[PDB]
Amino acid sequence: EVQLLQSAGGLVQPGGSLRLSCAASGFTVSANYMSWVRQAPGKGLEWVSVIYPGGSTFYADSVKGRFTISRDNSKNTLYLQMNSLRVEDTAVYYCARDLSVAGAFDIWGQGTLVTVSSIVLTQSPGTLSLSPGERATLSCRASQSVSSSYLAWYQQKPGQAPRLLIYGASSRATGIPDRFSGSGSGTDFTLTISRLEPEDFAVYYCQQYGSSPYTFGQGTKLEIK
Amino acid sequence: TQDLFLPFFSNVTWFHNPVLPFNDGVYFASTEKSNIIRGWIFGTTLDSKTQSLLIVNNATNVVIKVCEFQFCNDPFLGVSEFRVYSSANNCTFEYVSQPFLKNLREFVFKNIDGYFKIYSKHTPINLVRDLPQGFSALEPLVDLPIGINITRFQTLLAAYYVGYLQPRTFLLKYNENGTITDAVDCALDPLSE
Amino acid sequence: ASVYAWNRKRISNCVADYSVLYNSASFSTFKCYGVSPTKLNDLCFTNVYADSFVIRGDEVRQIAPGQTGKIADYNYKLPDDFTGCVIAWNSNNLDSKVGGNYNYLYRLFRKSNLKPFERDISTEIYQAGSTPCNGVEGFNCYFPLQSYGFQPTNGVGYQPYRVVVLSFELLHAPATVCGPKKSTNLVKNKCVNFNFNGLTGTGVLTESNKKFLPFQQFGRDIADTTDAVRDPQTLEILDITPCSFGGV
Ligand SMILES: *[C@@H]1O[C@H](CO)[C@@H](O)[C@H](O)[C@H]1NC(C)=O
Ligand SMILES: *[C@@H]1O[C@H](CO)[C@@H](O)[C@H](O)[C@H]1NC(C)=O
Ligand SMILES: *[C@@H]1O[C@H](CO)[C@@H](O)[C@H](O)[C@H]1NC(C)=O
C-alpha cells in the first residue's frame, strides 16, 4: 500500500512565500528518484524539478533558480518552497517517484491548487468520438525520433491522479488489464484499447523521457457520440 | 667542494642481518669472494605502507623493483625459488640494467630531492686481511627517480662494512685526464685546514 | 569497456608523441582546462593515465571541472584537479548493430555520489524500498543496471561515442616523458649560437681531442668557464672558442 499525501490548499498573496509537502509511505526518499510535474489545466502537462538520490536538484528549462526543492530524511518529506509568485502560475503540482527506464511514474501524488493574486511531441488523432464494442488507435509523433524505448503513456482522470498504462511502449505496468496494446517505431507510437469499458473513457497522454526536459502530449480526451 | 662525504680516519662497524638506520647516506664495503651478495632493501616501514625499494638479481641483468612487497627475515633463493615477497599493492617503477660485474666492492647510496644515486666500484686487491692503504674514486653507476623517503634498510644474502655520511668540505686533485688522484678533508688537522 | 566498468591504462617510460594529436581533424571536442594545448612537448608530468568509455550522445558535455548529472554522479567523476584533457570520437556502424547493442551497461541507481576517480562494481539490489531484497526481483527491489539501446538513427545524441580522458600527475616523482627534438644539424668552424642540452652560449664548435669520461658531459676551465661540450648524437666532444673581438 503506497500513499502520497500533499497539503498546499492555500491562497498566496502576491510576492509571498509558500511551502508544499510530499510524504512517503514505506519507501525511503533518500535512495530513489522523485519528480515534480505541473498539471497545467486546459493544456498539456509539463515538468518542474527532479531530485535524484543524493540531492542534486534539476529544474526545468523555462524556470531557473527561484523554486527551492529540498529533501528532509528526518520527517521523510519532499519539501518545495515557493518564492515570490508571479502571473500565470496557476496549476497543480503533482509529485511522483521516477523509474524512467523501468516504469515511468508508477505512482503519483493526489493533487492540490495554487492560485495567483486576484522536444516537439504531438498527438495526432484527437477526440475520436466512438462507442464501446470495437478498438481505437492513438498516434503520438515525435520530432527527435527517439530510438527504442523512451516514450510512455499515462491516463488522466477528472479529480484523480495520473496513472501509468505502459512504460517504454513495450510492456504495460503492473495491474494494467491486457486490453491495452502498443506498437510503432522510429517516429510515432500507436496505442490501442480493445473492448472499451465504462471505466476506460479518460484522457490519454504520451510523454518522452531519457532526453532533454520531459514533454507530455497536448491531451486526447475520449467522448461518446 | 662542500658536499656529503665520508670523513677521513673514521671508524665504521664490521658486521657478520641486523637492521640499519639511514641518516643521510650509506657507504657499503664488501668482499666478492664470499659471493653472499646482491640484496638490498630500503624504506621507512615494513608492512604494506609507503613505497619501498628492492635491489636484487638472479645471476643476470640487475632488476630493481620499487614495487610494494612484504619482506621476510632471511629469504634464501636459488640452489630455483623466489619467495622474498608475500603481497603486493601497487608498483611505480621497474629498472633493468647490466649486472654490476681477490676483489672488493665499494658502494655509496645517497638520496636527495627525489633522486636515488648509487655510486659503485669494483677493485682488484692483492691484500686480503683488511682495507688496503690506497685511494680510489667512485664513478656513478645508477640514478633513479623515485621521490620517496628512506629511513632504514636491510642487506640480504658474513663480512661487510657500513659507514655514515655528514656534510664536509673536500679538496680534490684531478689528473691530466678526468680521474681523481688525491683528496684532502678541510675539517681536520690544522695542516689540512 | 563501457562506462559502468571504465578501463584505464598507464603510459610507461617512453617519448611522448603529441604532435599528431592536434594535427588530426578526427577530433571535434578537444576542449580541456589546464596547460596550454600547444606546449605539450614542453611538459614534465610524472605519470599519465588514459581512461576509456563508450558513453552515448550529448552526455559527453557534462565532463567539466565540477558538474553533476546522470553521468557524473555514480560513474566517472571529474574533480577540480583533473589536469589533463578529454577526447571524443565519432560513432558509426563499426560500433553498432542492426539488431541492436545489449552488452553495455550503465549505473542508474545508487545511494551516494561517487568520489573522483573512483569505481564501484557491486550490482545486486540498490534497495529502493525498506522491504527485504534478499535477491527476488519485485516491488521495492529493483536491479540498478540498465542495458544501452542503440539503433541506426539520426545520430545527433543516440550514438555510442568513444570518450577517452588523459590525466597527468603533478609532482610525486621526476618525469621521464619530456622529449624535445629541435631537429638541428651540426655546424663547425664558424661562429654560431648553441643550446647544447641546456648550455646556452655563442662560439665556434671546432674539433676536440680530449678524453672525456663516459659519465661526463661538459668540461670546465680554471676560471670556471665552459670549454668543451659532448654532443649526444654521435657522443662527440667539441671545443668552444669565443667569438673574435678586439679594437680598431
Ligand atoms: C670509534 O671507536 C670508539 C671506541 O671503539 C668509539 O667510542 C667512537 O665513537 C668511534 N667513532 C665513531 C663511532 O665515529
Ligand atoms: C630472474 O627472474 C626473472 C623474473 O623473476 C625471470 O624472468 C628470469 O628468467 C630469471 N632469471 C634467472 C637466471 O633465473
Ligand atoms: C691519461 O691519459 C693518457 C693519454 O695519453 C693515457 O696514456 C693514460 O693512460 C691516462 N691515465 C693515466 C696517466 O693514469
XYZ file of C-alpha atoms and ligand atoms in Angstrom:
708
model
C 0.000 0.000 0.000
C 1.753 3.119 -1.321
C 0.301 6.532 -0.472
C 1.473 10.065 -1.272
C -0.036 12.958 0.691
C 0.110 16.684 -0.072
C -1.106 19.800 1.741
C -0.977 23.031 -0.270
C -4.596 24.235 -0.334
C -3.888 27.868 0.477
C -4.135 31.110 -1.473
C -0.866 33.029 -1.816
C -0.531 36.799 -1.640
C 1.420 38.431 -4.490
C 5.137 38.259 -3.820
C 4.567 35.843 -0.941
C 6.221 32.591 0.105
C 4.712 29.102 0.313
C 5.773 25.617 1.412
C 4.464 22.398 -0.142
C 4.874 18.878 1.222
C 5.114 15.360 -0.199
C 5.309 12.409 2.189
C 6.302 8.739 1.901
C 4.505 5.513 2.814
C 7.185 2.844 3.075
C 9.874 3.659 0.508
C 12.911 5.670 1.575
C 13.183 9.008 -0.214
C 16.985 9.131 0.117
C 17.505 6.174 -2.252
C 15.010 6.763 -5.086
C 14.146 9.318 -7.750
C 11.474 11.982 -7.276
C 9.965 14.359 -9.818
C 7.555 17.303 -9.828
C 5.126 17.885 -12.697
C 2.824 20.814 -13.420
C -0.642 19.670 -14.472
C -1.439 22.915 -16.352
C -5.239 22.556 -16.629
C -6.562 23.272 -20.103
C -3.246 22.328 -21.748
C -0.615 19.607 -21.641
C 1.361 18.705 -18.548
C 4.918 19.933 -18.052
C 7.985 19.411 -15.858
C 9.179 21.372 -12.822
C 12.016 19.624 -10.989
C 13.702 16.301 -10.224
C 15.615 15.151 -7.136
C 17.970 12.205 -7.559
C 19.293 10.124 -4.679
C 21.972 12.274 -3.230
C 20.155 15.580 -3.559
C 21.350 17.300 -6.702
C 18.489 19.475 -7.960
C 17.366 19.591 -11.594
C 14.993 22.311 -12.799
C 13.020 22.836 -15.984
C 14.345 24.984 -18.829
C 11.853 27.858 -18.582
C 12.089 28.254 -14.785
C 15.500 28.716 -13.158
C 16.635 29.076 -9.563
C 13.613 30.561 -7.801
C 11.930 27.260 -6.897
C 13.701 25.743 -3.878
C 13.284 21.967 -3.533
C 14.758 20.050 -0.599
C 14.518 16.528 0.817
C 14.193 16.001 4.579
C 15.027 12.475 5.731
C 14.212 13.330 9.360
C 10.477 13.627 8.621
C 10.513 11.685 5.308
C 9.420 14.704 3.281
C 9.986 16.211 -0.159
C 9.550 19.874 0.709
C 9.295 22.508 -2.014
C 9.434 26.192 -1.089
C 7.717 28.614 -3.465
C 9.275 32.078 -3.692
C 7.560 35.263 -4.930
C 4.787 34.079 -7.249
C 4.004 35.921 -10.490
C 1.166 35.796 -13.026
C 0.099 32.638 -14.924
C 1.457 30.154 -12.370
C -1.914 28.569 -11.517
C -1.857 24.776 -11.906
C -1.469 21.562 -9.927
C 1.921 20.474 -8.599
C 1.955 16.666 -8.685
C 4.914 14.809 -7.186
C 5.830 11.233 -8.022
C 8.660 8.726 -7.866
C 10.522 8.129 -11.125
C 11.927 4.891 -12.576
C 12.054 6.151 -16.162
C 13.832 3.154 -17.709
C 11.752 0.503 -15.892
C 8.338 2.015 -15.201
C 7.675 5.712 -15.819
C 5.932 7.373 -12.852
C 4.309 4.234 -11.462
C 2.629 6.048 -8.544
C 1.727 9.740 -8.262
C 0.517 12.054 -5.523
C -3.067 13.285 -5.191
C -3.157 16.941 -6.244
C -3.594 20.489 -4.946
C -4.249 24.022 -6.206
C -2.107 27.175 -6.143
C -3.692 30.451 -7.245
C -2.406 33.924 -8.167
C -3.262 37.445 -6.999
C -6.906 38.290 -7.751
C 11.331 18.065 -27.988
C 8.337 18.558 -30.285
C 5.835 15.860 -29.307
C 2.321 15.850 -30.756
C -0.755 13.609 -30.584
C -2.463 13.126 -33.949
C -5.990 11.609 -33.719
C -7.935 13.981 -31.484
C -11.232 13.396 -29.691
C -12.236 10.492 -31.998
C -15.726 10.012 -30.597
C -16.643 6.318 -30.693
C -18.774 3.693 -28.946
C -17.853 0.624 -26.876
C -17.533 -2.667 -28.735
C -14.539 -2.003 -31.018
C -10.947 -0.765 -30.786
C -9.273 2.577 -31.451
C -5.849 3.914 -32.416
C -3.993 6.797 -30.758
C -0.887 8.085 -32.546
C 1.896 10.071 -30.864
C 4.526 11.632 -33.139
C 7.918 12.968 -32.075
C 10.260 15.316 -33.925
C 13.525 13.946 -32.487
C 12.588 10.331 -33.385
C 13.716 8.626 -30.194
C 15.238 5.232 -30.903
C 13.514 2.435 -28.970
C 12.001 2.817 -25.509
C 11.985 6.398 -24.187
C 8.239 7.072 -24.517
C 5.442 6.160 -22.107
C 1.692 6.650 -21.726
C -0.388 7.954 -18.815
C -4.130 8.101 -18.160
C -5.657 11.191 -16.571
C -8.846 11.071 -14.522
C -11.096 14.012 -13.547
C -10.252 14.837 -9.920
C -7.777 11.959 -9.556
C -4.031 11.465 -10.128
C -2.497 10.337 -13.436
C -1.946 6.595 -13.755
C 0.669 4.715 -15.756
C -0.584 2.442 -18.539
C 2.500 1.273 -20.474
C 6.181 2.009 -19.841
C 8.595 2.082 -22.759
C 5.744 1.377 -25.220
C 6.603 -2.337 -24.996
C 5.079 -3.749 -21.786
C 2.272 -2.424 -19.605
C 2.610 -1.654 -15.904
C 1.567 -3.955 -13.075
C -2.184 -4.294 -12.633
C -2.927 -2.941 -16.120
C -5.577 -5.025 -17.934
C -4.460 -6.886 -21.047
C -6.739 -4.878 -23.382
C -4.082 -2.159 -23.834
C -1.522 -2.666 -26.604
C 1.282 -0.585 -28.065
C 3.334 -0.647 -31.245
C 5.221 1.604 -33.645
C 8.848 2.585 -34.112
C 11.087 5.336 -35.432
C 8.962 8.487 -35.223
C 5.461 7.609 -33.970
C 3.940 5.259 -31.416
C 0.434 3.805 -31.596
C -1.709 2.710 -28.652
C -4.834 0.565 -28.976
C -7.553 -0.190 -26.416
C -9.699 -3.248 -27.130
C -13.210 -3.963 -25.784
C -13.733 -0.471 -24.398
C -15.275 -0.481 -20.910
C -17.199 2.190 -18.958
C -14.161 2.633 -16.686
C -11.957 3.473 -19.673
C -13.271 6.824 -21.002
C -10.359 9.028 -19.960
C -7.718 11.373 -21.340
C -4.547 9.696 -22.621
C -1.140 11.399 -22.559
C 2.094 10.343 -24.261
C 5.329 11.543 -22.665
C 9.015 11.378 -23.542
C 11.963 10.746 -21.225
C 15.643 9.815 -21.385
C 16.446 13.094 -23.139
C 16.154 16.891 -22.759
C 13.397 18.091 -20.327
C 10.402 15.757 -20.366
C 7.470 16.723 -22.578
C 3.891 15.445 -22.456
C 1.218 15.495 -25.127
C -1.413 18.183 -25.512
C -4.182 15.852 -24.338
C -6.559 13.410 -26.040
C -9.971 13.029 -24.407
C -12.401 10.190 -25.096
C -16.028 11.225 -25.581
C -19.150 9.357 -26.692
C -21.102 10.347 -29.803
C 83.621 21.430 -2.934
C 81.270 21.246 0.052
C 79.109 18.122 -0.049
C 78.225 14.911 1.779
C 81.350 12.751 2.083
C 82.678 10.067 4.417
C 85.209 11.778 6.725
C 88.785 10.541 6.671
C 90.089 8.384 9.525
C 86.674 7.454 10.901
C 85.787 4.035 12.304
C 82.859 2.053 10.886
C 81.237 -1.105 12.215
C 82.145 -4.583 10.963
C 79.089 -6.829 10.693
C 78.804 -10.594 10.315
C 71.290 -9.333 9.182
C 70.902 -6.556 11.749
C 68.593 -3.736 10.706
C 70.358 -0.484 9.949
C 69.213 3.158 10.105
C 69.792 5.745 7.376
C 70.619 9.304 8.433
C 71.870 10.979 5.246
C 73.742 8.383 3.177
C 75.408 4.990 3.295
C 78.898 3.773 2.407
C 78.945 -0.005 1.925
C 82.015 -2.208 1.529
C 82.024 -5.910 0.713
C 84.339 -8.717 -0.377
C 83.330 -10.575 -3.527
C 84.912 -13.969 -2.750
C 82.157 -14.868 -0.277
C 79.557 -14.500 -3.076
C 76.808 -13.997 -0.456
C 75.830 -10.729 -2.079
C 73.269 -8.950 -4.305
C 70.482 -7.940 -1.943
C 69.300 -4.554 -0.681
C 66.021 -3.329 0.821
C 65.299 0.309 1.708
C 62.274 2.022 3.179
C 60.616 3.675 6.145
C 58.218 0.887 7.200
C 57.836 -2.845 6.585
C 54.134 -3.853 6.433
C 52.101 -2.715 3.403
C 52.768 1.014 3.616
C 54.668 3.788 1.804
C 56.726 2.556 -1.140
C 59.963 0.657 -0.520
C 62.865 -0.368 -2.734
C 64.299 -3.781 -3.583
C 67.607 -4.346 -5.395
C 68.450 -7.967 -6.261
C 69.404 -10.031 -9.291
C 69.250 -13.717 -10.224
C 72.643 -14.147 -11.926
C 71.699 -11.899 -14.874
C 70.648 -8.302 -15.605
C 70.175 -6.380 -12.369
C 66.487 -5.844 -11.607
C 65.304 -3.031 -9.334
C 61.678 -3.331 -8.226
C 60.329 -0.468 -6.126
C 57.106 -2.470 -6.163
C 55.460 -2.635 -2.743
C 56.193 -6.009 -1.145
C 56.037 -7.814 2.192
C 59.531 -8.912 3.185
C 60.761 -11.813 5.319
C 63.708 -12.320 7.664
C 66.205 -14.416 5.652
C 64.806 -15.087 2.140
C 67.181 -17.689 0.733
C 66.846 -18.184 -3.028
C 68.382 -20.391 -5.680
C 70.405 -23.548 -5.224
C 65.142 -22.289 -8.051
C 62.658 -20.400 -5.870
C 61.619 -16.772 -5.356
C 59.876 -16.205 -2.013
C 61.128 -12.797 -0.857
C 57.698 -11.149 -1.002
C 54.221 -12.128 0.173
C 51.782 -9.457 -1.054
C 51.887 -6.527 -3.476
C 49.657 -3.440 -3.537
C 50.938 -1.347 -6.458
C 54.173 -0.532 -8.252
C 55.544 2.654 -9.799
C 58.993 1.911 -11.269
C 60.989 -1.002 -12.666
C 64.666 -0.853 -13.639
C 66.643 -3.373 -15.691
C 70.355 -2.807 -16.205
C 73.626 -4.600 -16.842
C 74.901 -6.706 -13.907
C 77.385 -4.925 -11.649
C 80.305 -7.125 -12.722
C 90.596 -11.042 -4.801
C 88.094 -8.230 -5.352
C 86.358 -5.576 -3.252
C 83.043 -3.791 -3.853
C 82.509 -0.202 -2.709
C 79.026 1.327 -2.923
C 77.636 4.718 -1.936
C 73.887 5.299 -1.627
C 72.584 8.867 -1.451
C 69.077 10.334 -1.544
C 68.057 13.964 -2.046
C 65.317 15.872 -3.894
C 63.593 12.743 -5.157
C 66.769 11.254 -6.653
C 68.423 7.997 -5.611
C 72.104 7.959 -6.565
C 74.126 4.739 -6.405
C 77.881 5.003 -6.974
C 79.728 1.724 -7.441
C 83.278 0.492 -7.873
C 84.822 -2.972 -8.242
C 88.528 -3.115 -7.436
C 91.096 -5.940 -7.507
C 93.353 -6.138 -4.464
C 96.402 -8.183 -3.521
C 95.967 -7.977 0.251
C 93.157 -9.989 1.821
C 93.104 -9.076 5.537
C 91.516 -5.617 5.579
C 91.202 -2.365 3.627
C 94.440 -1.593 1.741
C 96.201 1.748 2.081
C 95.162 3.464 -1.136
C 92.773 5.884 -2.783
C 90.117 5.075 -5.385
C 87.358 7.238 -6.836
C 83.710 6.206 -7.207
C 82.207 6.544 -10.685
C 78.404 6.973 -10.592
C 76.595 3.946 -11.931
C 72.865 4.219 -11.143
C 70.453 7.149 -10.919
C 66.776 6.527 -10.185
C 63.870 8.991 -9.975
C 61.615 7.749 -7.154
C 60.607 10.696 -4.965
C 60.122 8.786 -1.702
C 61.824 8.867 1.707
C 64.193 6.242 3.114
C 64.771 5.794 6.840
C 66.052 2.257 7.359
C 67.395 -0.674 5.396
C 68.373 -4.344 5.173
C 71.218 -6.178 3.496
C 70.428 -9.636 2.148
C 72.194 -12.895 1.370
C 79.358 -12.508 6.899
C 81.810 -9.687 6.155
C 80.654 -6.202 5.164
C 81.293 -2.690 6.466
C 78.767 0.147 6.747
C 79.506 3.819 7.359
C 77.528 7.036 7.606
C 77.796 10.444 5.953
C 77.586 14.037 7.150
C 78.385 17.188 5.147
C 82.040 18.175 4.792
C 84.408 20.166 2.579
C 86.916 18.395 0.345
C 89.781 19.445 -1.919
C 90.233 17.084 -4.875
C 93.083 16.970 -7.391
C 92.405 15.946 -10.990
C 94.952 14.392 -13.338
C 95.616 15.462 -16.913
C 92.687 13.133 -17.595
C 89.342 13.349 -15.807
C 90.250 10.965 -12.975
C 90.765 11.839 -9.303
C 94.140 11.133 -7.684
C 94.053 12.630 -4.180
C 91.745 14.440 -1.777
C 92.071 16.429 1.451
C 89.414 16.887 4.149
C 89.137 20.512 5.274
C 87.602 19.897 8.718
C 90.683 18.114 10.054
C 94.237 18.700 11.294
C 95.250 22.394 11.077
C 97.691 21.296 8.376
C 94.718 20.169 6.273
C 92.942 23.419 7.117
C 34.918 -1.052 -21.987
C 31.647 0.631 -21.060
C 31.100 3.399 -18.510
C 29.966 1.014 -15.753
C 33.392 -0.682 -15.826
C 35.680 2.034 -17.172
C 39.148 0.780 -18.101
C 42.446 2.584 -17.541
C 45.962 2.290 -18.932
C 49.097 3.963 -17.599
C 51.763 5.001 -20.096
C 55.251 3.794 -19.181
C 58.638 5.449 -19.746
C 58.746 6.492 -23.405
C 58.958 9.567 -25.620
C 55.527 11.197 -25.684
C 54.179 11.683 -29.220
C 51.664 14.533 -29.031
C 52.238 16.361 -32.335
C 49.974 14.042 -34.362
C 47.058 14.607 -31.958
C 46.022 18.179 -32.788
C 47.018 17.732 -36.450
C 44.248 15.131 -36.807
C 40.894 16.537 -37.926
C 39.093 13.488 -36.493
C 38.815 15.259 -33.118
C 35.917 17.677 -32.663
C 35.783 18.065 -28.848
C 39.388 18.813 -27.891
C 38.244 21.151 -25.102
C 40.088 20.833 -21.797
C 41.215 23.029 -18.906
C 44.766 23.216 -17.599
C 48.015 23.660 -19.519
C 48.013 25.261 -22.961
C 47.047 22.981 -25.885
C 50.278 23.928 -27.705
C 53.099 23.285 -25.199
C 52.598 19.527 -24.869
C 56.196 18.673 -25.805
C 57.376 21.053 -23.045
C 55.629 19.263 -20.155
C 57.114 17.057 -17.428
C 54.177 15.414 -15.696
C 55.349 12.342 -13.798
C 52.753 9.806 -14.960
C 49.897 9.773 -17.469
C 46.781 7.578 -17.372
C 44.219 7.038 -20.141
C 40.648 6.106 -19.193
C 38.172 4.980 -21.842
C 34.400 4.608 -22.049
C 31.639 4.414 -24.639
C 29.067 6.893 -23.291
C 26.330 7.997 -25.688
C 25.238 11.268 -27.274
C 25.165 14.661 -25.589
C 26.088 13.092 -22.228
C 29.733 13.861 -23.074
C 29.302 17.604 -22.469
C 28.841 17.010 -18.724
C 32.599 16.343 -18.487
C 33.773 19.554 -16.801
C 35.767 20.665 -13.736
C 32.779 20.206 -11.446
C 29.439 19.008 -12.799
C 26.502 16.882 -11.666
C 24.099 14.778 -13.681
C 23.024 11.281 -14.599
C 26.578 10.508 -15.745
C 28.807 12.413 -13.287
C 27.077 11.251 -10.099
C 27.580 7.472 -9.807
C 30.226 6.970 -12.500
C 33.407 8.565 -13.880
C 33.800 11.827 -11.959
C 35.999 14.778 -12.903
C 37.496 16.636 -9.914
C 38.757 20.215 -9.854
C 42.361 18.915 -10.067
C 41.910 16.727 -13.152
C 44.961 18.117 -15.013
C 44.904 16.634 -18.491
C 42.383 16.559 -21.326
C 39.382 14.740 -22.790
C 38.996 13.464 -26.362
C 35.771 12.398 -28.087
C 35.277 10.210 -31.155
C 32.547 9.630 -33.746
C 30.315 6.563 -33.809
C 29.316 4.616 -36.914
C 28.390 1.079 -37.969
C 31.761 -0.011 -36.544
C 30.182 0.213 -33.067
C 26.522 -0.568 -33.815
C 24.273 -3.454 -34.826
C 21.149 -3.824 -36.950
C 19.537 -5.894 -34.205
C 20.990 -3.612 -31.539
C 23.579 -3.450 -28.782
C 22.700 -5.075 -25.457
C 26.083 -5.970 -23.909
C 26.667 -2.470 -22.482
C 25.509 -1.278 -19.060
C 25.393 1.977 -17.116
C 24.773 2.761 -13.458
C 21.407 4.388 -12.799
C 20.569 3.720 -9.139
C 22.831 4.290 -6.130
C 22.798 5.937 -2.701
C 25.646 8.486 -2.623
C 27.807 10.446 -5.035
C 30.983 8.679 -6.125
C 34.321 10.209 -5.208
C 36.510 11.484 -8.072
C 38.453 8.761 -9.895
C 36.545 6.020 -8.075
C 34.686 2.938 -9.283
C 32.007 0.895 -7.500
C 31.240 -2.505 -9.031
C 28.663 -4.266 -6.846
C 25.338 -4.838 -8.617
C 22.703 -6.912 -6.827
C 19.998 -4.528 -5.483
C 20.072 -0.815 -4.665
C 17.219 -1.185 -2.121
C 14.756 1.480 -3.215
C 12.303 0.414 -0.506
C 12.621 -0.764 3.081
C 11.370 -4.286 2.337
C 13.898 -7.153 2.302
C 15.697 -7.598 -1.027
C 17.396 -10.966 -0.489
C 17.529 -11.468 -4.260
C 13.938 -11.514 -5.524
C 13.139 -9.139 -8.381
C 9.970 -7.275 -7.477
C 8.463 -4.226 -5.842
C 10.901 -2.172 -3.719
C 13.707 -4.448 -5.039
C 14.906 -3.311 -8.470
C 18.077 -4.001 -10.421
C 20.143 -0.792 -10.723
C 21.993 -1.501 -14.006
C 20.250 -0.981 -17.344
C 21.333 -2.071 -20.812
C 22.013 0.503 -23.510
C 19.729 0.745 -26.518
C 21.467 1.511 -29.812
C 19.827 1.535 -33.249
C 20.702 3.227 -36.556
C 19.170 6.681 -36.102
C 19.956 10.330 -36.825
C 22.990 10.127 -34.533
C 22.752 13.607 -33.005
C 22.506 12.191 -29.481
C 21.810 8.465 -29.888
C 25.204 7.044 -30.849
C 27.814 5.218 -28.746
C 30.524 7.873 -28.738
C 34.035 6.906 -27.650
C 35.440 9.165 -24.931
C 38.961 8.957 -23.511
C 40.456 11.038 -20.704
C 44.177 11.694 -20.248
C 45.167 12.513 -16.660
C 48.594 13.750 -15.550
C 50.399 13.626 -12.213
C 51.778 16.878 -10.818
C 54.719 16.064 -8.526
C 55.457 12.753 -6.834
C 58.457 11.526 -8.874
C 60.650 13.127 -11.545
C 59.173 12.772 -15.014
C 60.532 10.681 -17.886
C 58.326 11.733 -20.836
C 59.890 15.121 -21.663
C 61.000 14.831 -25.278
C 62.008 17.834 -27.357
C 63.546 17.378 -30.800
C 64.624 20.791 -32.219
C 65.752 18.912 -35.366
C 69.063 20.748 -35.896
C 72.235 19.604 -37.650
C 75.762 20.442 -36.527
C 77.823 23.363 -37.815
C 81.556 23.795 -37.259
C 84.437 26.219 -37.822
C 82.070 29.218 -37.857
C 80.513 31.445 -35.221
C 77.146 30.138 -34.048
C 74.792 30.302 -31.082
C 74.342 26.910 -29.428
C 71.919 25.379 -26.922
C 73.577 22.014 -26.277
C 71.276 20.282 -23.764
C 70.708 23.395 -21.662
C 74.095 25.071 -22.233
C 73.249 28.361 -23.944
C 76.196 30.188 -25.458
C 77.921 31.539 -28.544
C 81.149 30.372 -30.126
C 82.832 28.237 -32.762
C 82.424 24.463 -32.451
C 85.800 23.141 -33.552
C 87.042 19.547 -33.382
C 88.316 18.420 -29.983
C 90.827 15.744 -28.998
C 90.177 15.306 -25.269
C 89.354 12.077 -23.404
C 86.091 12.799 -21.557
C 84.983 10.077 -19.172
C 81.855 8.140 -20.210
C 79.701 9.735 -17.489
C 80.930 13.306 -18.105
C 79.097 15.755 -20.372
C 80.941 19.091 -20.405
C 84.331 20.313 -19.260
C 85.407 23.470 -17.488
C 88.439 25.720 -17.134
C 90.333 27.054 -14.117
C 88.207 30.218 -14.007
C 85.033 28.075 -14.225
C 84.090 28.703 -17.851
C 82.768 26.179 -20.349
C 85.454 24.743 -22.610
C 84.085 21.570 -24.232
C 80.635 20.017 -24.613
C 79.535 16.498 -25.557
C 77.004 16.476 -28.380
C 74.775 13.453 -27.540
C 74.053 12.318 -31.103
C 77.322 10.633 -32.063
C 78.519 11.242 -28.476
C 81.233 13.610 -29.654
C 83.227 16.173 -27.682
C 83.535 19.630 -29.254
C 85.591 22.565 -28.004
C 84.346 26.137 -27.630
C 86.312 29.248 -28.597
C 84.941 32.771 -28.034
C 83.965 34.980 -30.940
C 86.881 37.025 -32.240
C 86.747 40.578 -30.908
C 89.108 43.491 -30.459
C 89.677 47.167 -31.018
C 90.346 49.391 -34.009
C 85.476 4.885 17.288
O 85.638 3.877 18.309
C 85.488 4.352 19.655
C 85.757 3.174 20.561
O 85.636 1.944 19.860
C 84.094 4.940 19.842
O 83.977 5.462 21.161
C 83.857 6.045 18.822
O 82.536 6.556 18.955
C 84.078 5.521 17.405
N 83.901 6.593 16.436
C 82.764 6.803 15.758
C 81.648 5.837 16.019
O 82.653 7.720 14.950
C 65.147 -13.976 -12.982
O 63.803 -13.625 -12.627
C 63.037 -13.090 -13.716
C 61.697 -12.688 -13.149
O 61.571 -13.073 -11.787
C 62.930 -14.125 -14.833
O 62.242 -13.550 -15.938
C 64.319 -14.576 -15.267
O 64.213 -15.625 -16.221
C 65.127 -15.054 -14.064
N 66.477 -15.415 -14.467
C 67.145 -16.452 -13.950
C 68.524 -16.681 -14.491
O 66.658 -17.171 -13.083
C 95.783 9.638 -19.046
O 95.724 9.949 -20.448
C 96.850 9.467 -21.195
C 96.701 9.998 -22.602
O 97.804 9.624 -23.415
C 96.894 7.945 -21.133
O 98.027 7.480 -21.857
C 96.976 7.485 -19.684
O 96.885 6.066 -19.618
C 95.846 8.108 -18.855
N 95.897 7.688 -17.454
C 96.855 7.921 -16.531
C 98.060 8.721 -16.953
O 96.747 7.495 -15.386
